[PDB]
């Protein structure tokens, strides 16, 4: 619904440590001690779309990424002021669907940039302030563009897309809907 933005951050930072050989949960606190969002309420599709779009961002900046830690000065919590520099541009110059994946992508990398210097304690801190920045700043904008579901409508996980595309090639049809949108309680 709303705090599901937390997942989108967390799931990515988790994967970020995974490709380094670190654990997110070992250095976490986000959903560790408090429960914000489910394991994939709405996000199951949106985070699935997010990680793909995030990947699209990673490789592109990966050229500079390894060197930039010197520029951001990835250190104690003030690395969020380093990531501030960038999230600052990131918001002013065009907050779109795929644009937001950049925020959670470099944020997930910001995580590892900390773990890099063996400061994996930032890992949970960043994820907190990332999802929060989404909560306060991004979420309104997101809603103006449809929402997280809409993101997967546009740039959703094409792996699952191709997965269902196989049988959809034969056209399954015979699927009617009496349901109207996602209902809440």
């Amino acid at each position: 619904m709303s705090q599901s933005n937390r997942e989108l951050v967390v799931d990515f930072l988790s994967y970020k440590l995974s490709q380094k050989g670190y654990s997110w949960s070992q250095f976490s606190d986000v959903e560790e001690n408090r429960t914000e969002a489910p394991e994939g309420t709405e996000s199951e599709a949106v985070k699935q779309a997010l990680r793909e779009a995030g990947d699209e961002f990673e490789l592109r900046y990966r050229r500079a990424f390894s060197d930039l830690t010197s520029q951001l000065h990835i250190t104690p919590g003030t690395a969020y002021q380093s990531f501030e520099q960038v999230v600052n541009e990131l918001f002013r110059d065009g907050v779109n669907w795929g644009r937001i994946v950049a925020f959670f992508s470099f944020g997930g990398a910001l995580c590892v940039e900390s773990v890099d210097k063996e400061m994996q304690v930032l890992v949970s801190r960043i994820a907190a302030w990332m999802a929060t920045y989404l909560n306060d700043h991004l979420e309104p904008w997101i809603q103006e563009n449809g929402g997280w579901d809409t993101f997967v409508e546009l740039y959703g996980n094409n792996a699952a897309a191709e997965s269902r595309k196989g049988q959809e090639r034969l056209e399954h049809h015979h699927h009617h809907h009496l349901e109207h949108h996602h209902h809440h309680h």
């Binding site: 779009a53 699209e56 961002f57 592109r60 900046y61 500079a64 930039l68 520029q71 951001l72 380093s82 520099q85 960038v86 600052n88 541009e89 990131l90 110059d93 065009g94 795929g98 644009r99 994946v101 950049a102 470099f106």
Partner: peptide
């Protein structure tokens, strides 16, 4: 330097 400018810029490439 960069980063703010760099991700600002490289970020507009999340489509093409």
């Amino acid at each position: 330097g960069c980063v703010g400018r760099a991700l600002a810029a490289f970020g507009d490439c999340i489509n093409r």
